[PDB]
């Protein structure tokens, strides 16, 4: 059962079917494959972007299918909607209301777990007390922790 | 009591006296600098208030 | 090819895909390479702007097809939207909503790492206590000394 | 680098000559270029006046060098 769309070529032809049933679209120009890998580069940019499990650059001969996926099952419905919006100007078209709504909510799912992980304050400042309210503070007078 | 060798009696008391003339007496004259003179210290040829 | 464009032969065709140039425009130009060099001249001086990982390649032997921008892999996904907008009035066109949105969000993610690193308070004022909670600072006044 | 800014503003100015008005990208870049030239300049030219004669030298200083300004302490 394929919802997974292993090998990114399948995602691009899925956008063509989403845009038009007969798969007839206006003028276009090749090298939208570098745009797909660049989207997965920018996501997870210096470890601060949305984690997609892709490398910054991949290749085989095209870069798009140089990494087949490395995505979750859930993460598939994220990527091909954001991809649909990106290659839509390349086909001289623009994404519909359902596609842009799912595209924003999609990249939010991959970041959903990452957000909670990065949400947690770092330990106390370089000055902190501990008084006599502790027996064995781990050395009296804290900063961070002695 | 004090060491049999006279100069050795100096040296044994000089080691604790080193922290007296470095750390202690430095801070000591700063007390008298705040009370008998200005609270702020260590600005050089400043004309600002 | 590749998720990283550091070659100006791949730069022109990458911008041309986003601008959807099939030579049905009023003219065809070589400007895209020259466009990025001008756009990362401006962004790299006069208080700078966005920093994209670009390194200069101005005043060199190539016609502007052999020169190397040296952009990051993740820096690809930003630039070709901003480049396709600027050469659009020359072709008597104006970029769509997706191109201008991604162009602004893209360059913001490239400046994201820079603006984090430039954050930190300036040194203490000319008048600051030396404290007595401090243990042996061996100094009076913190001017611009620390 | 200043070249890269000014010709966007120039493209707007030659537009009335040709009986046209500049499009949205040209005016956006032109204002950004106009803003970017004076970006670092305005920060450096932002200054406040030195202390008046009204300001006291202060006797709370170390090495006071006399007391009380008149533009000489």
mmCIF file with all atom_site columns, N, CA and C in Angstrom, chain A residues 27-32 34-35 37-39 41-42 45-46 48-50 56-59 61 63 82 85-86 89-92 94 107 127, chain C residues 1-5 13-14 16-18 20-22 24-25 72-74 76-78 80-81 96 98-99 102 105-106 109-110 112-113 116:
data_model
loop_
_atom_site.group_PDB
_atom_site.id
_atom_site.type_symbol
_atom_site.label_atom_id
_atom_site.label_alt_id
_atom_site.label_comp_id
_atom_site.label_asym_id
_atom_site.label_entity_id
_atom_site.label_seq_id
_atom_site.pdbx_PDB_ins_code
_atom_site.Cartn_x
_atom_site.Cartn_y
_atom_site.Cartn_z
_atom_site.occupancy
_atom_site.B_iso_or_equiv
_atom_site.pdbx_formal_charge
_atom_site.auth_seq_id
_atom_site.auth_comp_id
_atom_site.auth_asym_id
_atom_site.auth_atom_id
_atom_site.pdbx_PDB_model_num
ATOM 1   N N  . UNK A 1 27  ? 3.194  26.019 -19.715 1.00 0.00 ? 27  UNK A N  1
ATOM 2   C CA . UNK A 1 27  ? 4.626  26.013 -19.923 1.00 0.00 ? 27  UNK A CA 1
ATOM 3   C C  . UNK A 1 27  ? 5.422  25.883 -18.648 1.00 0.00 ? 27  UNK A C  1
ATOM 4   N N  . UNK A 1 28  ? 6.610  25.245 -18.764 1.00 0.00 ? 28  UNK A N  1
ATOM 5   C CA . UNK A 1 28  ? 7.437  24.926 -17.634 1.00 0.00 ? 28  UNK A CA 1
ATOM 6   C C  . UNK A 1 28  ? 8.839  24.784 -18.156 1.00 0.00 ? 28  UNK A C  1
ATOM 7   N N  . UNK A 1 29  ? 9.820  24.730 -17.227 1.00 0.00 ? 29  UNK A N  1
ATOM 8   C CA . UNK A 1 29  ? 11.212 24.622 -17.556 1.00 0.00 ? 29  UNK A CA 1
ATOM 9   C C  . UNK A 1 29  ? 11.824 23.746 -16.499 1.00 0.00 ? 29  UNK A C  1
ATOM 10  N N  . UNK A 1 30  ? 12.676 22.789 -16.949 1.00 0.00 ? 30  UNK A N  1
ATOM 11  C CA . UNK A 1 30  ? 13.378 21.806 -16.154 1.00 0.00 ? 30  UNK A CA 1
ATOM 12  C C  . UNK A 1 30  ? 14.381 22.472 -15.239 1.00 0.00 ? 30  UNK A C  1
ATOM 13  N N  . UNK A 1 31  ? 14.648 21.815 -14.080 1.00 0.00 ? 31  UNK A N  1
ATOM 14  C CA . UNK A 1 31  ? 15.509 22.203 -12.985 1.00 0.00 ? 31  UNK A CA 1
ATOM 15  C C  . UNK A 1 31  ? 14.625 22.673 -11.862 1.00 0.00 ? 31  UNK A C  1
ATOM 16  N N  . UNK A 1 32  ? 13.509 21.931 -11.659 1.00 0.00 ? 32  UNK A N  1
ATOM 17  C CA . UNK A 1 32  ? 12.667 22.039 -10.493 1.00 0.00 ? 32  UNK A CA 1
ATOM 18  C C  . UNK A 1 32  ? 13.093 20.986 -9.498  1.00 0.00 ? 32  UNK A C  1
ATOM 19  N N  . UNK A 1 34  ? 16.274 20.686 -8.370  1.00 0.00 ? 34  UNK A N  1
ATOM 20  C CA . UNK A 1 34  ? 17.192 21.346 -7.464  1.00 0.00 ? 34  UNK A CA 1
ATOM 21  C C  . UNK A 1 34  ? 16.424 22.132 -6.436  1.00 0.00 ? 34  UNK A C  1
ATOM 22  N N  . UNK A 1 35  ? 15.182 22.551 -6.782  1.00 0.00 ? 35  UNK A N  1
ATOM 23  C CA . UNK A 1 35  ? 14.311 23.317 -5.923  1.00 0.00 ? 35  UNK A CA 1
ATOM 24  C C  . UNK A 1 35  ? 13.716 22.435 -4.854  1.00 0.00 ? 35  UNK A C  1
ATOM 25  N N  . UNK A 1 37  ? 15.242 19.593 -3.546  1.00 0.00 ? 37  UNK A N  1
ATOM 26  C CA . UNK A 1 37  ? 16.308 19.290 -2.617  1.00 0.00 ? 37  UNK A CA 1
ATOM 27  C C  . UNK A 1 37  ? 16.684 20.488 -1.789  1.00 0.00 ? 37  UNK A C  1
ATOM 28  N N  . UNK A 1 38  ? 16.611 21.705 -2.379  1.00 0.00 ? 38  UNK A N  1
ATOM 29  C CA . UNK A 1 38  ? 16.877 22.954 -1.701  1.00 0.00 ? 38  UNK A CA 1
ATOM 30  C C  . UNK A 1 38  ? 15.840 23.260 -0.645  1.00 0.00 ? 38  UNK A C  1
ATOM 31  N N  . UNK A 1 39  ? 14.574 22.819 -0.855  1.00 0.00 ? 39  UNK A N  1
ATOM 32  C CA . UNK A 1 39  ? 13.484 22.966 0.089   1.00 0.00 ? 39  UNK A CA 1
ATOM 33  C C  . UNK A 1 39  ? 13.732 22.109 1.306   1.00 0.00 ? 39  UNK A C  1
ATOM 34  N N  . UNK A 1 41  ? 16.765 21.269 2.171   1.00 0.00 ? 41  UNK A N  1
ATOM 35  C CA . UNK A 1 41  ? 17.999 21.803 2.701   1.00 0.00 ? 41  UNK A CA 1
ATOM 36  C C  . UNK A 1 41  ? 17.686 22.890 3.692   1.00 0.00 ? 41  UNK A C  1
ATOM 37  N N  . UNK A 1 42  ? 16.927 23.920 3.228   1.00 0.00 ? 42  UNK A N  1
ATOM 38  C CA . UNK A 1 42  ? 16.408 25.040 3.988   1.00 0.00 ? 42  UNK A CA 1
ATOM 39  C C  . UNK A 1 42  ? 15.632 24.608 5.205   1.00 0.00 ? 42  UNK A C  1
ATOM 40  N N  . UNK A 1 45  ? 17.970 23.838 8.344   1.00 0.00 ? 45  UNK A N  1
ATOM 41  C CA . UNK A 1 45  ? 19.069 24.724 8.034   1.00 0.00 ? 45  UNK A CA 1
ATOM 42  C C  . UNK A 1 45  ? 19.847 24.978 9.288   1.00 0.00 ? 45  UNK A C  1
ATOM 43  N N  . UNK A 1 46  ? 21.093 24.444 9.310   1.00 0.00 ? 46  UNK A N  1
ATOM 44  C CA . UNK A 1 46  ? 22.055 24.507 10.388  1.00 0.00 ? 46  UNK A CA 1
ATOM 45  C C  . UNK A 1 46  ? 21.532 23.891 11.662  1.00 0.00 ? 46  UNK A C  1
ATOM 46  N N  . UNK A 1 48  ? 18.554 24.128 12.784  1.00 0.00 ? 48  UNK A N  1
ATOM 47  C CA . UNK A 1 48  ? 17.597 25.012 13.406  1.00 0.00 ? 48  UNK A CA 1
ATOM 48  C C  . UNK A 1 48  ? 16.295 24.996 12.655  1.00 0.00 ? 48  UNK A C  1
ATOM 49  N N  . UNK A 1 49  ? 16.255 24.410 11.439  1.00 0.00 ? 49  UNK A N  1
ATOM 50  C CA . UNK A 1 49  ? 15.040 24.338 10.665  1.00 0.00 ? 49  UNK A CA 1
ATOM 51  C C  . UNK A 1 49  ? 14.220 23.150 11.086  1.00 0.00 ? 49  UNK A C  1
ATOM 52  N N  . UNK A 1 50  ? 13.088 22.927 10.373  1.00 0.00 ? 50  UNK A N  1
ATOM 53  C CA . UNK A 1 50  ? 12.197 21.801 10.546  1.00 0.00 ? 50  UNK A CA 1
ATOM 54  C C  . UNK A 1 50  ? 12.918 20.544 10.119  1.00 0.00 ? 50  UNK A C  1
ATOM 55  N N  . UNK A 1 56  ? 21.540 18.047 3.435   1.00 0.00 ? 56  UNK A N  1
ATOM 56  C CA . UNK A 1 56  ? 21.577 19.349 2.804   1.00 0.00 ? 56  UNK A CA 1
ATOM 57  C C  . UNK A 1 56  ? 21.666 19.226 1.303   1.00 0.00 ? 56  UNK A C  1
ATOM 58  N N  . UNK A 1 57  ? 22.459 18.250 0.810   1.00 0.00 ? 57  UNK A N  1
ATOM 59  C CA . UNK A 1 57  ? 22.570 17.984 -0.598  1.00 0.00 ? 57  UNK A CA 1
ATOM 60  C C  . UNK A 1 57  ? 22.661 16.502 -0.731  1.00 0.00 ? 57  UNK A C  1
ATOM 61  N N  . UNK A 1 58  ? 21.979 15.983 -1.771  1.00 0.00 ? 58  UNK A N  1
ATOM 62  C CA . UNK A 1 58  ? 21.973 14.591 -2.125  1.00 0.00 ? 58  UNK A CA 1
ATOM 63  C C  . UNK A 1 58  ? 22.045 14.606 -3.617  1.00 0.00 ? 58  UNK A C  1
ATOM 64  N N  . UNK A 1 59  ? 22.428 13.462 -4.224  1.00 0.00 ? 59  UNK A N  1
ATOM 65  C CA . UNK A 1 59  ? 22.547 13.375 -5.654  1.00 0.00 ? 59  UNK A CA 1
ATOM 66  C C  . UNK A 1 59  ? 22.498 11.914 -5.991  1.00 0.00 ? 59  UNK A C  1
ATOM 67  N N  . UNK A 1 61  ? 21.779 11.203 -10.031 1.00 0.00 ? 61  UNK A N  1
ATOM 68  C CA . UNK A 1 61  ? 22.096 12.180 -11.038 1.00 0.00 ? 61  UNK A CA 1
ATOM 69  C C  . UNK A 1 61  ? 21.170 13.356 -10.788 1.00 0.00 ? 61  UNK A C  1
ATOM 70  N N  . UNK A 1 63  ? 19.099 15.559 -7.851  1.00 0.00 ? 63  UNK A N  1
ATOM 71  C CA . UNK A 1 63  ? 19.208 15.630 -6.407  1.00 0.00 ? 63  UNK A CA 1
ATOM 72  C C  . UNK A 1 63  ? 17.908 15.292 -5.732  1.00 0.00 ? 63  UNK A C  1
ATOM 73  N N  . UNK A 1 82  ? 3.531  21.276 0.211   1.00 0.00 ? 82  UNK A N  1
ATOM 74  C CA . UNK A 1 82  ? 4.473  22.379 0.128   1.00 0.00 ? 82  UNK A CA 1
ATOM 75  C C  . UNK A 1 82  ? 5.194  22.393 -1.195  1.00 0.00 ? 82  UNK A C  1
ATOM 76  N N  . UNK A 1 85  ? 2.894  23.746 -3.988  1.00 0.00 ? 85  UNK A N  1
ATOM 77  C CA . UNK A 1 85  ? 2.855  25.183 -4.011  1.00 0.00 ? 85  UNK A CA 1
ATOM 78  C C  . UNK A 1 85  ? 4.092  25.746 -4.657  1.00 0.00 ? 85  UNK A C  1
ATOM 79  N N  . UNK A 1 86  ? 5.250  25.056 -4.518  1.00 0.00 ? 86  UNK A N  1
ATOM 80  C CA . UNK A 1 86  ? 6.534  25.551 -4.961  1.00 0.00 ? 86  UNK A CA 1
ATOM 81  C C  . UNK A 1 86  ? 6.712  25.399 -6.448  1.00 0.00 ? 86  UNK A C  1
ATOM 82  N N  . UNK A 1 89  ? 4.198  27.812 -9.499  1.00 0.00 ? 89  UNK A N  1
ATOM 83  C CA . UNK A 1 89  ? 4.693  28.903 -10.328 1.00 0.00 ? 89  UNK A CA 1
ATOM 84  C C  . UNK A 1 89  ? 5.547  28.463 -11.487 1.00 0.00 ? 89  UNK A C  1
ATOM 85  N N  . UNK A 1 90  ? 6.267  27.319 -11.364 1.00 0.00 ? 90  UNK A N  1
ATOM 86  C CA . UNK A 1 90  ? 7.080  26.750 -12.421 1.00 0.00 ? 90  UNK A CA 1
ATOM 87  C C  . UNK A 1 90  ? 6.206  26.283 -13.563 1.00 0.00 ? 90  UNK A C  1
ATOM 88  N N  . UNK A 1 91  ? 4.974  25.798 -13.255 1.00 0.00 ? 91  UNK A N  1
ATOM 89  C CA . UNK A 1 91  ? 4.010  25.358 -14.241 1.00 0.00 ? 91  UNK A CA 1
ATOM 90  C C  . UNK A 1 91  ? 3.109  26.498 -14.657 1.00 0.00 ? 91  UNK A C  1
ATOM 91  N N  . UNK A 1 92  ? 3.362  27.738 -14.162 1.00 0.00 ? 92  UNK A N  1
ATOM 92  C CA . UNK A 1 92  ? 2.584  28.933 -14.430 1.00 0.00 ? 92  UNK A CA 1
ATOM 93  C C  . UNK A 1 92  ? 1.159  28.786 -13.948 1.00 0.00 ? 92  UNK A C  1
ATOM 94  N N  . UNK A 1 94  ? -1.011 28.461 -9.700  1.00 0.00 ? 94  UNK A N  1
ATOM 95  C CA . UNK A 1 94  ? -0.901 28.817 -8.310  1.00 0.00 ? 94  UNK A CA 1
ATOM 96  C C  . UNK A 1 94  ? -1.800 27.864 -7.575  1.00 0.00 ? 94  UNK A C  1
ATOM 97  N N  . UNK A 1 107 ? 4.023  21.084 7.545   1.00 0.00 ? 107 UNK A N  1
ATOM 98  C CA . UNK A 1 107 ? 5.389  21.278 7.993   1.00 0.00 ? 107 UNK A CA 1
ATOM 99  C C  . UNK A 1 107 ? 5.422  21.550 9.478   1.00 0.00 ? 107 UNK A C  1
ATOM 100 N N  . UNK A 1 127 ? 24.286 33.390 39.061  1.00 0.00 ? 127 UNK A N  1
ATOM 101 C CA . UNK A 1 127 ? 24.157 33.821 40.429  1.00 0.00 ? 127 UNK A CA 1
ATOM 102 C C  . UNK A 1 127 ? 22.875 33.186 40.890  1.00 0.00 ? 127 UNK A C  1
ATOM 103 N N  . UNK C 2 1   ? 21.807 20.435 -11.244 1.00 0.00 ? 1   UNK C N  1
ATOM 104 C CA . UNK C 2 1   ? 22.171 19.245 -10.431 1.00 0.00 ? 1   UNK C CA 1
ATOM 105 C C  . UNK C 2 1   ? 22.635 19.667 -9.060  1.00 0.00 ? 1   UNK C C  1
ATOM 106 N N  . UNK C 2 2   ? 22.530 18.730 -8.082  1.00 0.00 ? 2   UNK C N  1
ATOM 107 C CA . UNK C 2 2   ? 22.845 18.894 -6.679  1.00 0.00 ? 2   UNK C CA 1
ATOM 108 C C  . UNK C 2 2   ? 21.966 19.888 -5.959  1.00 0.00 ? 2   UNK C C  1
ATOM 109 N N  . UNK C 2 3   ? 21.917 19.760 -4.610  1.00 0.00 ? 3   UNK C N  1
ATOM 110 C CA . UNK C 2 3   ? 21.109 20.595 -3.753  1.00 0.00 ? 3   UNK C CA 1
ATOM 111 C C  . UNK C 2 3   ? 21.796 21.903 -3.472  1.00 0.00 ? 3   UNK C C  1
ATOM 112 N N  . UNK C 2 4   ? 23.058 22.039 -3.946  1.00 0.00 ? 4   UNK C N  1
ATOM 113 C CA . UNK C 2 4   ? 23.915 23.160 -3.689  1.00 0.00 ? 4   UNK C CA 1
ATOM 114 C C  . UNK C 2 4   ? 24.282 23.670 -5.049  1.00 0.00 ? 4   UNK C C  1
ATOM 115 N N  . UNK C 2 5   ? 24.146 25.000 -5.240  1.00 0.00 ? 5   UNK C N  1
ATOM 116 C CA . UNK C 2 5   ? 24.481 25.675 -6.464  1.00 0.00 ? 5   UNK C CA 1
ATOM 117 C C  . UNK C 2 5   ? 25.603 26.570 -6.044  1.00 0.00 ? 5   UNK C C  1
ATOM 118 N N  . UNK C 2 13  ? 19.802 28.946 -15.021 1.00 0.00 ? 13  UNK C N  1
ATOM 119 C CA . UNK C 2 13  ? 18.719 28.034 -15.309 1.00 0.00 ? 13  UNK C CA 1
ATOM 120 C C  . UNK C 2 13  ? 17.825 27.767 -14.120 1.00 0.00 ? 13  UNK C C  1
ATOM 121 N N  . UNK C 2 14  ? 18.338 27.935 -12.873 1.00 0.00 ? 14  UNK C N  1
ATOM 122 C CA . UNK C 2 14  ? 17.571 27.764 -11.658 1.00 0.00 ? 14  UNK C CA 1
ATOM 123 C C  . UNK C 2 14  ? 16.618 28.905 -11.415 1.00 0.00 ? 14  UNK C C  1
ATOM 124 N N  . UNK C 2 16  ? 15.642 30.908 -13.971 1.00 0.00 ? 16  UNK C N  1
ATOM 125 C CA . UNK C 2 16  ? 14.826 30.826 -15.154 1.00 0.00 ? 16  UNK C CA 1
ATOM 126 C C  . UNK C 2 16  ? 13.681 29.856 -15.019 1.00 0.00 ? 16  UNK C C  1
ATOM 127 N N  . UNK C 2 17  ? 13.812 28.804 -14.170 1.00 0.00 ? 17  UNK C N  1
ATOM 128 C CA . UNK C 2 17  ? 12.742 27.864 -13.897 1.00 0.00 ? 17  UNK C CA 1
ATOM 129 C C  . UNK C 2 17  ? 11.632 28.512 -13.110 1.00 0.00 ? 17  UNK C C  1
ATOM 130 N N  . UNK C 2 18  ? 12.005 29.295 -12.069 1.00 0.00 ? 18  UNK C N  1
ATOM 131 C CA . UNK C 2 18  ? 11.097 30.015 -11.208 1.00 0.00 ? 18  UNK C CA 1
ATOM 132 C C  . UNK C 2 18  ? 10.392 31.144 -11.930 1.00 0.00 ? 18  UNK C C  1
ATOM 133 N N  . UNK C 2 20  ? 9.910  31.012 -15.168 1.00 0.00 ? 20  UNK C N  1
ATOM 134 C CA . UNK C 2 20  ? 9.244  30.270 -16.222 1.00 0.00 ? 20  UNK C CA 1
ATOM 135 C C  . UNK C 2 20  ? 9.545  30.849 -17.584 1.00 0.00 ? 20  UNK C C  1
ATOM 136 N N  . UNK C 2 21  ? 10.851 30.885 -17.936 1.00 0.00 ? 21  UNK C N  1
ATOM 137 C CA . UNK C 2 21  ? 11.322 31.478 -19.159 1.00 0.00 ? 21  UNK C CA 1
ATOM 138 C C  . UNK C 2 21  ? 11.416 30.371 -20.167 1.00 0.00 ? 21  UNK C C  1
ATOM 139 N N  . UNK C 2 22  ? 10.625 30.487 -21.258 1.00 0.00 ? 22  UNK C N  1
ATOM 140 C CA . UNK C 2 22  ? 10.668 29.576 -22.379 1.00 0.00 ? 22  UNK C CA 1
ATOM 141 C C  . UNK C 2 22  ? 10.953 30.385 -23.623 1.00 0.00 ? 22  UNK C C  1
ATOM 142 N N  . UNK C 2 24  ? 9.361  33.265 -24.553 1.00 0.00 ? 24  UNK C N  1
ATOM 143 C CA . UNK C 2 24  ? 8.145  33.827 -25.100 1.00 0.00 ? 24  UNK C CA 1
ATOM 144 C C  . UNK C 2 24  ? 8.011  35.223 -24.537 1.00 0.00 ? 24  UNK C C  1
ATOM 145 N N  . UNK C 2 25  ? 9.063  35.683 -23.820 1.00 0.00 ? 25  UNK C N  1
ATOM 146 C CA . UNK C 2 25  ? 9.166  36.971 -23.184 1.00 0.00 ? 25  UNK C CA 1
ATOM 147 C C  . UNK C 2 25  ? 9.629  37.974 -24.223 1.00 0.00 ? 25  UNK C C  1
ATOM 148 N N  . UNK C 2 72  ? 25.520 28.558 0.190   1.00 0.00 ? 72  UNK C N  1
ATOM 149 C CA . UNK C 2 72  ? 25.201 27.370 0.944   1.00 0.00 ? 72  UNK C CA 1
ATOM 150 C C  . UNK C 2 72  ? 24.103 26.616 0.237   1.00 0.00 ? 72  UNK C C  1
ATOM 151 N N  . UNK C 2 73  ? 23.950 25.315 0.575   1.00 0.00 ? 73  UNK C N  1
ATOM 152 C CA . UNK C 2 73  ? 22.927 24.433 0.052   1.00 0.00 ? 73  UNK C CA 1
ATOM 153 C C  . UNK C 2 73  ? 21.539 24.919 0.383   1.00 0.00 ? 73  UNK C C  1
ATOM 154 N N  . UNK C 2 74  ? 21.354 25.341 1.654   1.00 0.00 ? 74  UNK C N  1
ATOM 155 C CA . UNK C 2 74  ? 20.126 25.889 2.172   1.00 0.00 ? 74  UNK C CA 1
ATOM 156 C C  . UNK C 2 74  ? 19.865 27.292 1.678   1.00 0.00 ? 74  UNK C C  1
ATOM 157 N N  . UNK C 2 76  ? 20.145 28.195 -1.395  1.00 0.00 ? 76  UNK C N  1
ATOM 158 C CA . UNK C 2 76  ? 19.628 28.082 -2.743  1.00 0.00 ? 76  UNK C CA 1
ATOM 159 C C  . UNK C 2 76  ? 18.162 28.442 -2.740  1.00 0.00 ? 76  UNK C C  1
ATOM 160 N N  . UNK C 2 77  ? 17.394 27.853 -1.791  1.00 0.00 ? 77  UNK C N  1
ATOM 161 C CA . UNK C 2 77  ? 15.949 27.904 -1.697  1.00 0.00 ? 77  UNK C CA 1
ATOM 162 C C  . UNK C 2 77  ? 15.376 29.284 -1.448  1.00 0.00 ? 77  UNK C C  1
ATOM 163 N N  . UNK C 2 78  ? 16.238 30.268 -1.113  1.00 0.00 ? 78  UNK C N  1
ATOM 164 C CA . UNK C 2 78  ? 15.846 31.627 -0.867  1.00 0.00 ? 78  UNK C CA 1
ATOM 165 C C  . UNK C 2 78  ? 16.046 32.408 -2.130  1.00 0.00 ? 78  UNK C C  1
ATOM 166 N N  . UNK C 2 80  ? 16.715 32.238 -5.492  1.00 0.00 ? 80  UNK C N  1
ATOM 167 C CA . UNK C 2 80  ? 16.193 32.206 -6.844  1.00 0.00 ? 80  UNK C CA 1
ATOM 168 C C  . UNK C 2 80  ? 14.803 32.788 -6.969  1.00 0.00 ? 80  UNK C C  1
ATOM 169 N N  . UNK C 2 81  ? 14.088 32.980 -5.832  1.00 0.00 ? 81  UNK C N  1
ATOM 170 C CA . UNK C 2 81  ? 12.843 33.702 -5.811  1.00 0.00 ? 81  UNK C CA 1
ATOM 171 C C  . UNK C 2 81  ? 13.055 35.192 -5.867  1.00 0.00 ? 81  UNK C C  1
ATOM 172 N N  . UNK C 2 96  ? 4.377  36.299 -8.852  1.00 0.00 ? 96  UNK C N  1
ATOM 173 C CA . UNK C 2 96  ? 3.159  35.852 -8.212  1.00 0.00 ? 96  UNK C CA 1
ATOM 174 C C  . UNK C 2 96  ? 3.362  35.875 -6.707  1.00 0.00 ? 96  UNK C C  1
ATOM 175 N N  . UNK C 2 98  ? 3.280  33.477 -4.348  1.00 0.00 ? 98  UNK C N  1
ATOM 176 C CA . UNK C 2 98  ? 4.113  32.451 -3.761  1.00 0.00 ? 98  UNK C CA 1
ATOM 177 C C  . UNK C 2 98  ? 5.574  32.806 -3.858  1.00 0.00 ? 98  UNK C C  1
ATOM 178 N N  . UNK C 2 99  ? 5.996  33.462 -4.967  1.00 0.00 ? 99  UNK C N  1
ATOM 179 C CA . UNK C 2 99  ? 7.386  33.783 -5.209  1.00 0.00 ? 99  UNK C CA 1
ATOM 180 C C  . UNK C 2 99  ? 7.845  34.863 -4.262  1.00 0.00 ? 99  UNK C C  1
ATOM 181 N N  . UNK C 2 102 ? 7.911  33.382 -0.405  1.00 0.00 ? 102 UNK C N  1
ATOM 182 C CA . UNK C 2 102 ? 9.036  32.493 -0.201  1.00 0.00 ? 102 UNK C CA 1
ATOM 183 C C  . UNK C 2 102 ? 10.333 33.256 -0.252  1.00 0.00 ? 102 UNK C C  1
ATOM 184 N N  . UNK C 2 105 ? 10.551 34.993 3.236   1.00 0.00 ? 105 UNK C N  1
ATOM 185 C CA . UNK C 2 105 ? 10.695 33.998 4.278   1.00 0.00 ? 105 UNK C CA 1
ATOM 186 C C  . UNK C 2 105 ? 12.011 33.274 4.158   1.00 0.00 ? 105 UNK C C  1
ATOM 187 N N  . UNK C 2 106 ? 12.514 33.103 2.920   1.00 0.00 ? 106 UNK C N  1
ATOM 188 C CA . UNK C 2 106 ? 13.748 32.423 2.636   1.00 0.00 ? 106 UNK C CA 1
ATOM 189 C C  . UNK C 2 106 ? 14.927 33.205 3.107   1.00 0.00 ? 106 UNK C C  1
ATOM 190 N N  . UNK C 2 109 ? 15.366 33.244 6.889   1.00 0.00 ? 109 UNK C N  1
ATOM 191 C CA . UNK C 2 109 ? 15.916 32.032 7.460   1.00 0.00 ? 109 UNK C CA 1
ATOM 192 C C  . UNK C 2 109 ? 17.414 31.985 7.288   1.00 0.00 ? 109 UNK C C  1
ATOM 193 N N  . UNK C 2 110 ? 17.946 32.668 6.250   1.00 0.00 ? 110 UNK C N  1
ATOM 194 C CA . UNK C 2 110 ? 19.364 32.767 5.994   1.00 0.00 ? 110 UNK C CA 1
ATOM 195 C C  . UNK C 2 110 ? 20.009 33.756 6.940   1.00 0.00 ? 110 UNK C C  1
ATOM 196 N N  . UNK C 2 112 ? 18.645 34.245 9.905   1.00 0.00 ? 112 UNK C N  1
ATOM 197 C CA . UNK C 2 112 ? 18.209 33.746 11.191  1.00 0.00 ? 112 UNK C CA 1
ATOM 198 C C  . UNK C 2 112 ? 19.354 33.401 12.102  1.00 0.00 ? 112 UNK C C  1
ATOM 199 N N  . UNK C 2 113 ? 20.395 32.719 11.568  1.00 0.00 ? 113 UNK C N  1
ATOM 200 C CA . UNK C 2 113 ? 21.547 32.308 12.339  1.00 0.00 ? 113 UNK C CA 1
ATOM 201 C C  . UNK C 2 113 ? 22.421 33.483 12.700  1.00 0.00 ? 113 UNK C C  1
ATOM 202 N N  . UNK C 2 116 ? 20.883 35.757 15.702  1.00 0.00 ? 116 UNK C N  1
ATOM 203 C CA . UNK C 2 116 ? 20.961 35.056 16.963  1.00 0.00 ? 116 UNK C CA 1
ATOM 204 C C  . UNK C 2 116 ? 22.329 35.302 17.553  1.00 0.00 ? 116 UNK C C  1
#
